[PDB]
Amino acid sequence: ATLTAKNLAKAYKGRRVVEDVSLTVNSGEIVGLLGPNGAGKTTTFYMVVGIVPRDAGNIIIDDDDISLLPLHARARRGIGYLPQEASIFRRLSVYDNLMAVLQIRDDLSAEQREDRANELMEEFHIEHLRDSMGQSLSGGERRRVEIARALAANPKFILLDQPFAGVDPISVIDIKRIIEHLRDSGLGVLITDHNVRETLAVCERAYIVSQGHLIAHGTPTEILQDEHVKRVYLG
Amino acid sequence: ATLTAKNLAKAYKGRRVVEDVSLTVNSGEIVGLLGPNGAGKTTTFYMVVGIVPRDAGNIIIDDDDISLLPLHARARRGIGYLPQEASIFRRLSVYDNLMAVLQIRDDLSAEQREDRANELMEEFHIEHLRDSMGQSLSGGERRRVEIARALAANPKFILLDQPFAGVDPISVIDIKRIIEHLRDSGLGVLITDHNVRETLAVCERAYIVSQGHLIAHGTPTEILQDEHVKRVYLG
Ligand SMILES: Nc1ncnc2c1ncn2[C@@H]1O[C@H](COP(=O)(O)OP(=O)(O)OP(=O)(O)O)[C@@H](O)[C@H]1O
Ligand SMILES: Nc1ncnc2c1ncn2[C@@H]1O[C@H](COP(=O)(O)OP(=O)(O)OP(=O)(O)O)[C@@H](O)[C@H]1O
Ligand code: NA
Ligand code: NA
């Protein structure tokens, strides 16, 4: 499958924070979107997911233009999303958080949902926080739960907005391994994070945006060796 | 001046998440507190600042045990704090956010507060977001504003909980430079962040905690070469 964004544009009160951004992600591929603070990364993710209306552009899966589909419909088509901001339910336990998302799984019976929640807790090493309320979790614990919640939806394409934020080095390795397994399982992954080295390590190719514009695209080595990228982003 | 925490301990429902942690930070020194997710770092910061009551231990500045002082009193004694979680006022502009914190500055006249806010916006490269509401900021923009807010309080000791979270590489350099300037100006700095290399680069020494216990203390090189730290934290 192929997820394509064409000529995306977003302005806020006349300020064009995204301008003519096009990107593509395929099944079984991990693709990066990186760039300076305020460059328009999250806004771009928002327009793909359907969180904010676009001023221009198109969203397409395979042959179908899904630009007119609302958030819920795009999700049903297979678009998944891990927000940068906290997304956990504060009063619910880790287990109840997972079971809540799993309620959307029409392909799973009641018992299958319960098995999946236990599987996810095992996979993300959070079984010991099973009954812990979301609001009681440390930053890194919460991030694992939020990633697990995103996966519980069983997306075809997953947009990961800063999956490494607040996560320790061993957990970065674990999450990288999980992302690679998603890719091997046939998911397309679009990832943005400010841990450049760790993000480029998992990506096959990456887009670099700056001030709402795409300034570079290529393999990690090509990106790292790009003089313009070095100047305005890598430093 | 010297800030000292002695034998700090915190339990939640019988689970000891911090146990007998002691640390010291001096004026003109940058000290790190690092370790795995859930190790008790933020909880330790909370007990020093006065955000959560300690089960045991003491907080001391120079000769004065300030363990009995509430949050506001400890702040007046010079303890400053940048939370890990969002701390910006969502509906207020960047400028109004700064002016709000600066209202606590008894040492500054009305006009002096306004000058300081403009200085801070210049220093943190956020002048262009002057009238932007906190809720409209990107993640990295918001972090700069939050760091600026923490500094506006003019603390003697500043506890920085993940100052690099969501920040781009050039901004990491800028913030490092600002931290070093704080140190040269006589502040003591206690910093925790999950960007290990960048954090150790600014620290003179660091404490490593794991499962509520201090497992190592030393210079950055000593930490990085510690086999136990490599095993349970660095990977
Ligand atoms: N609701 C809004 N109103 C006005 N401006 C906004 C709004 N939301 C975002 N912006 C601005 O749009 C720009 C792009 O923000 P976005 O969150 O897409 O950046 P980003 O590349 O994800 O940044 P970061 O790396 O700092 O997370 C930012 O400069 C931000 O100030
Ligand atoms: N209110 C609470 N009730 C119960 N447990 C809590 C509460 N707050 C924190 N905890 C637990 O205390 C432990 C220590 O959390 P803390 O936030 O101090 O860790 P941290 O070292 O800052 O972690 P991270 O690196 O993930 O931010 C965590 O395992 C967390 O689940
Ligand atoms: Na963002
Ligand atoms: Na923390």
GROMACS .gro file of C-alpha atoms and ligand atoms in nm, chain A residues 41-42 84 161-162 192 194, chain B residues 138-140, ligand 3:
model
   11
   41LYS     CA    1   0.626   1.884   1.113
   42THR     CA    2   0.336   1.830   1.351
   84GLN     CA    3   0.358   1.443   2.048
  161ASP     CA    4   0.531   1.212   1.655
  162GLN     CA    5   0.838   1.198   1.884
  192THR     CA    6   0.956   1.241   1.343
  194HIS     CA    7   1.448   1.523   1.761
  373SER     CA    8   0.521   2.419   1.859
  374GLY     CA    9   0.685   2.181   2.105
  375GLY     CA   10   1.033   2.329   2.071
  473NA      NA   11   0.616   1.901   1.673
   0.00000   0.00000   0.00000
